[PDB]
Amino acid sequence: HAETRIVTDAPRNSESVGDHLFNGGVNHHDEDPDAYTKMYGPLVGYDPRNPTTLFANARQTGTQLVAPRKAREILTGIYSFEPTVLAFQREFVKRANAVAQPDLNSDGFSLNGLHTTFDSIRSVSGYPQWPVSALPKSNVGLLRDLKLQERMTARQVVIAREIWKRVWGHMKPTAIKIPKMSTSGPPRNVNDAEMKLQYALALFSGNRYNGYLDAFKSGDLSRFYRDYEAAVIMGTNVRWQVDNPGKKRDYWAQADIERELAPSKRPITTKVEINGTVYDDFAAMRTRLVNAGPWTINVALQPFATGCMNAMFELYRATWHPDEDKIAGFLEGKHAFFGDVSSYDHSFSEEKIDLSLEVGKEFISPEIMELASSLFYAAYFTRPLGPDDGPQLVGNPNRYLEKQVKAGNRSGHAFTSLFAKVWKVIDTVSKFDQMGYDVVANMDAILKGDMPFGCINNGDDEIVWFKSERDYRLFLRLLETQPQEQRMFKVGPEEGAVFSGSVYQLIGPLKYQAVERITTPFQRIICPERSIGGNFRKFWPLGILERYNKRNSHPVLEEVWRVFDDTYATLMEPHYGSFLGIVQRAHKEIPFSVDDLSWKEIMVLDDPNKMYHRFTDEEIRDQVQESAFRKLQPIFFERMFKEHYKGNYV
Ligand SMILES: [Mg+2]
Ligand SMILES: [Mg+2]
Ligand SMILES: [Mg+2]
Ligand SMILES: [Mg+2]
Ligand SMILES: [Mg+2]
């Protein structure tokens, strides 16, 4: 068929989606160019004078806060604002701190496996720090505050081009993941993976991908919206995590980002006060704004992000995807710096984002890179970030071909993870360069782990390793001496040498042993981001039982679990029932068993987005992946790649 539009002139909502189910073998939208139009309803309609109506049909609307205050159900029948729970938190933390204290050397390595104190467990889940910090229109104040370079050096640009050529220039075609449990974002704002899949099939049928790009590049939002159900705009969500009591933090106010491009931050002053009692020894949960790109934008980009990432994991495994179980042994006999990056994604400059996309255009049609740019710099809409704020549109989505919000490696983008991984390695390879090494001539060898130095990467987490002590101390001298003109990101040593959630305990001379942070099991039980069950914690017993079952695997861990069990038994059990009873009864009601799953699989059930950056299809069984994702195999977008990709297939 000739049809170039996803939404045609056919009557909408005239056929049931049940008559157009995807069989995994043929794209039925090739047979019927009107199918998508007929199986879904009329869009509400775009008003350029009122762009926020793009979100008026969402589950949460207008007035309701992005981060409401609401007690969490931490275990069956146990809620986080109850005074007995808070009493347990205080006593558990006293007793756990009496077990062990972090024992760190001058390089930040833990000698006992513990990297910090247990004080963050005095955080009240469901009690947010407010306001949630807004995203300013400009990150220049941050770049200034962090003392980052004004521009890349010439050499840094060379290195960035050499690495991006390797990344964009190779592709291992891989299925698009279609999330079951997240919103499509505008315009439909539904958690409907069937619609997402049918949209993908429509996009990749006939001439619709080129029609989509033509509509995009026209700058006519009314056209892109009408004919492709697409609008370049971010929604916003909030992520929550524990904090250390007493830690001073700051935030960008909604009223300031409205008035100023790069305003200064204001102090967060939230105190925990529950039913008329102040808890001065507790923290409110740290909160962070995350943007969310619409499905109907990200779907056009994801094939490239996923394919290039998967290629990179194969060709340059030693850098971007080593076996995590083997890292500690790999490091035996090596010196290592564990990177702690401050405000990483937000600290990317416009130059860095733009260069990445420029090199992309050598391998991928330029209009696709321009779509990526449009989303990186898109306007966003947020519901209120605090109790005194209103909903707010930041930027002008009517002018989406112009940059609206400059915020570095924008969250919610198809490319966010790829950019995080590649730029951390650009920075570290530039550091190898600044030491004096000839990194261009030896680029492949560095990335493949064949030189006497290299780096293991997981986005903003990294291990920079050296076979030679003298090379290692030269790297440390470089960090100490590096001037502003060379500084890409704000990086220091990680307290306790943590990588991907594990402490790399120093157990002998250049001998390491990985231990999951000993704070983690207790934070995730006692101070959770979300209540048990619901959308995101259906499988909550698994992570707990997995951790409990390995309690004897490390001597500090073992003692802290003994403190948990004894303290819970005395202070919680009389009122709420036994801990293991609650957890084991819940485990019986879910369709997975902890004994049958790998550690990787349990991680993915707790955080499915680890499939976009940490684990590949090969490492996770179908039943686990299918809990969270539908898939579209790459045969269904092969024609798009034949036209629009110019690199090498792996
Ligand atoms: Mg029928
Ligand atoms: Mg305080
Ligand atoms: Mg001012
Ligand atoms: Mg780190
Ligand atoms: Mg598999």
What is the C-alpha separation between 448 and 436, in angstroms, rounded?
20
Q: How far is the CA of 338 from the centre of ligand 4 (A)?
A: 6
Q: How far is the CA of 638 from the centre of ligand 5 (A)?
A: 22
Closest CA to 556 of 88, 118, 122: 118
- Residue that is written with structure tokens 């349990």 in the block: 602
Q: How far is the CA of 13 from the centre of ligand 3 (A)?
A: 51
- What are the backbone dihedrals phi and psi of residue 374, each rounded to the nearest 5 degrees, phi first? -55, -45
- What are the backbone dihedrals phi and psi of residue 171, each rounded to the nearest 5 degrees, phi first? -140, 130
User: Do the annotations mark residue 339 as ligand-binding?
Assistant: yes
What is the C-alpha separation between 170 and 553, in angstroms, rounded?
41
Closest CA to 461 of 410, 511, 517: 517
222 Cβ partners below 8 Å, 6+ apart?
Answer: 46, 48
Q: With the C-alpha atoms ordered 464, 465, 471, 473, is the resulting torsion angle positive or negative?
A: positive
The CA-atom distances, in angstroms, between 507 and each of 117, 221, 503 are 20, 60, 12
Count of Cβ atoms closer than 10 Å to residue 194 Cβ = 18
Ligand nearest to the CA of 626: 5
What is the C-alpha separation between 585 and 281, in angstroms, rounded?
33
Tokens representing 367? 């209009």
Ligand nearest to the CA of 124: 2
Q: How far is the CA of 631 from the centre of ligand 5 (A)?
A: 12
Closest CA to 6 of 212, 280, 218: 212
Q: How far is the CA of 280 from the centre of ligand 2 (A)?
A: 6
Asked if 423 and 340 count as a contact pair (C-beta separation under 8 A), the reply is no
Q: With the C-alpha atoms ordered 614, 618, 624, 628, is the resulting torsion angle positive or negative?
A: positive
591 Cβ partners below 8 Å, 6+ apart?
Answer: none
Method: X-ray
Q: How far is the CA of 501 from the centre of ligand 3 (A)?
A: 39
Asked if 641 and 627 count as a contact pair (C-beta separation under 8 A), the reply is no
Q: How far is the CA of 20 from the centre of ligand 1 (A)?
A: 9
What is the C-alpha separation between 380 and 219, in angstroms, rounded?
18
The CA-atom distances, in angstroms, between 326 and each of 99, 120, 290, 320 are 29, 30, 33, 14
Q: How far is the CA of 614 from the centre of ligand 2 (A)?
A: 35
640 Cβ partners below 8 Å, 6+ apart?
Answer: 204, 209, 303
Q: How far is the CA of 317 from the centre of ligand 5 (A)?
A: 18
What is the C-alpha separation between 326 and 161, in angstroms, rounded?
31
Closest CA to 620 of 636, 634, 603: 603
Ligand nearest to the CA of 127: 2
- Residue that is written with structure tokens 């039943």 in the block: 623
Question: 579: helix, coil or strand?
Answer: helix
Q: How far is the CA of 260 from the centre of ligand 3 (A)?
A: 6
Tokens representing 215? 């509509």
What is the C-alpha separation between 583 and 117, in angstroms, rounded?
26
What is the C-alpha separation between 338 and 342, in angstroms, rounded?
13
Q: How far is the CA of 103 from the centre of ligand 2 (A)?
A: 26
Cα 280 from chain centroid? 32
Q: How far is the CA of 18 from the centre of ligand 1 (A)?
A: 8
Count of Cβ atoms closer than 10 Å to residue 349 Cβ = 19
Taking phi over 0 as left and psi of -120 to 50 as alpha, with beta for the rest, 438 belongs to beta
Q: How far is the CA of 195 from the centre of ligand 3 (A)?
A: 45
Tokens representing 206? 């006939």
Q: How far is the CA of 25 from the centre of ligand 1 (A)?
A: 21
| Amino acid letter for position 510 | L
Q: What is the DSSP string of 581-596?
A: HHHHHHHHTSS--GGG
Q: How far is the CA of 438 from the centre of ligand 4 (A)?
A: 26
Tokens representing 563? 């403190």
Q: How far is the CA of 52 from the centre of ligand 5 (A)?
A: 40
Query: Secondary structure of 447-500 in the HEC alphabet?
Result: HCCCCCEEEEEECCEEEEEECCHHHHHHHHHHHHHCCHHHCCCEEEECCCCEEC
Surrounding ion ligand 4 within 5 Å at CB are 340, 461, 494
Ligand nearest to the CA of 20: 1
Closest CA to 115 of 402, 539, 499: 499
Count of Cβ atoms closer than 10 Å to residue 21 Cβ = 12
Closest CA to 498 of 463, 547, 469, 453: 463
To the nearest 10°, report the CA torsion of 181, 182, 184, 187.
120
What is the C-alpha separation between 248 and 219, in angstroms, rounded?
44
418 Cβ partners below 8 Å, 6+ apart?
Answer: 167, 305, 308, 309
Tokens representing 506? 């120093």
Asked if 560 and 522 count as a contact pair (C-beta separation under 8 A), the reply is yes
What is the C-alpha separation between 401 and 228, in angstroms, rounded?
17
Q: How far is the CA of 650 from the centre of ligand 4 (A)?
A: 30
Cβ neighbourhood burial of 259 (10 Å; 0-12, 13-18, 19+): exposed
Closest CA to 526 of 498, 547, 500: 547
Count of Cβ atoms closer than 10 Å to residue 342 Cβ = 14
What is the C-alpha separation between 185 and 216, in angstroms, rounded?
18
Q: How far is the CA of 259 from the centre of ligand 4 (A)?
A: 34
- Residue that is written with structure tokens 């995203």 in the block: 135
The CA-atom distances, in angstroms, between 286 and each of 416, 452, 492 are 22, 40, 22
What is the C-alpha separation between 170 and 444, in angstroms, rounded?
13
Asked if 409 and 141 count as a contact pair (C-beta separation under 8 A), the reply is no
Q: How far is the CA of 15 from the centre of ligand 1 (A)?
A: 7
Question: 352: helix, coil or strand?
Answer: helix
Asked if 135 and 407 count as a contact pair (C-beta separation under 8 A), the reply is yes
Closest CA to 230 of 176, 185, 175, 198: 185
Q: What is the DSSP string of 377-401?
A: T--EEE--SSTT---EEES-GGGTT
User: Do the annotations mark residue 566 as ligand-binding?
Assistant: no
Ligand nearest to the CA of 494: 4
The H-or-E segment that residue 127 falls in is: strand 123-128
User: Do the annotations mark residue 498 as ligand-binding?
Assistant: yes
What is the C-alpha separation between 376 and 408, in angstroms, rounded?
8
Number of H helices, E strands in the chain: 25, 22
Question: 304: helix, coil or strand?
Answer: helix
The H-or-E segment that residue 515 falls in is: strand 511-516
Q: Which stretches of 222-296 are assigned E, i.e. beta strand?
A: 235-241, 250-251, 266-267, 273-274, 277-278, 283-292
| Amino acid letter for position 185 | G
- Residue that is written with structure tokens 């986080």 in the block: 80
Strand partners, 490: 342
Ligand nearest to the CA of 19: 1
Closest CA to 395 of 63, 134, 64: 134
What is the C-alpha separation between 53 and 64, in angstroms, rounded?
15
Asked if 8 and 228 count as a contact pair (C-beta separation under 8 A), the reply is no
Tokens representing 193? 């993976």
Closest CA to 187 of 138, 224, 134, 160: 224
Count of Cβ atoms closer than 10 Å to residue 486 Cβ = 18
What is the C-alpha separation between 582 and 567, in angstroms, rounded?
16
Q: How far is the CA of 623 from the centre of ligand 5 (A)?
A: 9
Asked if 208 and 3 count as a contact pair (C-beta separation under 8 A), the reply is yes
Closest CA to 294 of 195, 428, 395, 362: 195
- Measure CA of the first residue to CA of the last residue in the chain; give whole Å: 31
107 Cβ partners below 8 Å, 6+ apart?
Answer: 493, 497
Question: 20: helix, coil or strand?
Answer: coil
Asked if 467 and 460 count as a contact pair (C-beta separation under 8 A), the reply is no
Q: How far is the CA of 461 from the centre of ligand 4 (A)?
A: 4
Ligand nearest to the CA of 249: 2
Asked if 374 and 308 count as a contact pair (C-beta separation under 8 A), the reply is no
To the nearest 10°, report the CA torsion of 425, 430, 434, 440.
110
Query: Secondary structure of 501-526 in the HEC alphabet?
Result: CEEEEEEECCEEEEEECCCHHHHHHH
Q: How far is the CA of 266 from the centre of ligand 3 (A)?
A: 12
Q: How far is the CA of 444 from the centre of ligand 5 (A)?
A: 29
User: Do the annotations mark residue 260 as ligand-binding?
Assistant: yes
Resolution of the structure in the document, Å: 1.7
Ligand nearest to the CA of 14: 1
Ligand nearest to the CA of 631: 5
Ligand nearest to the CA of 464: 4
167 Cβ partners below 8 Å, 6+ apart?
Answer: 308, 311, 312, 418, 422
Q: How far is the CA of 91 from the centre of ligand 4 (A)?
A: 30
Closest CA to 299 of 199, 186, 185, 223: 199
C-alpha angle 251/256/258, rounded to 5°?
Answer: 125
What is the C-alpha separation between 436 and 445, in angstroms, rounded?
16
C-alpha angle 606/608/611, rounded to 5°?
Answer: 130
Q: Which stretches of 155-216 are assigned E, i.e. beta strand?
A: 170-171, 176-179
What is the C-alpha separation between 267 and 260, in angstroms, rounded?
17
Q: How far is the CA of 562 from the centre of ligand 2 (A)?
A: 29
User: Do the annotations mark residue 620 as ligand-binding?
Assistant: yes
Ligand nearest to the CA of 615: 5
User: Do the annotations mark residue 643 as ligand-binding?
Assistant: no
Closest CA to 292 of 54, 486, 115: 54
Ligand nearest to the CA of 282: 2
Count of Cβ atoms closer than 10 Å to residue 111 Cβ = 13
What is the C-alpha separation between 271 and 279, in angstroms, rounded?
8
Q: With the C-alpha atoms ordered 596, 602, 604, 606, is the resulting torsion angle positive or negative?
A: positive
Closest CA to 505 of 336, 288, 271: 336
Asked if 586 and 541 count as a contact pair (C-beta separation under 8 A), the reply is yes
- Residue that is written with structure tokens 């402490």 in the block: 503
- What are the backbone dihedrals phi and psi of residue 632, each rounded to the nearest 5 degrees, phi first? -120, 115
Radius of gyration from C-alpha coordinates of the chain: 25
Is-cis flag, bond preceding 541, omega within 30? no
Ligand nearest to the CA of 15: 1
User: Do the annotations mark residue 257 as ligand-binding?
Assistant: no
Asked if 293 and 185 count as a contact pair (C-beta separation under 8 A), the reply is yes
562 Cβ partners below 8 Å, 6+ apart?
Answer: none
C-alpha angle 30/35/40, rounded to 5°?
Answer: 145
Is-cis flag, bond preceding 187, omega within 30? yes
What is the C-alpha separation between 215 and 203, in angstroms, rounded?
13
472 Cβ partners below 8 Å, 6+ apart?
Answer: 335, 336, 337, 466
DSSP structure class, residue 264: P
| Amino acid letter for position 371 | L
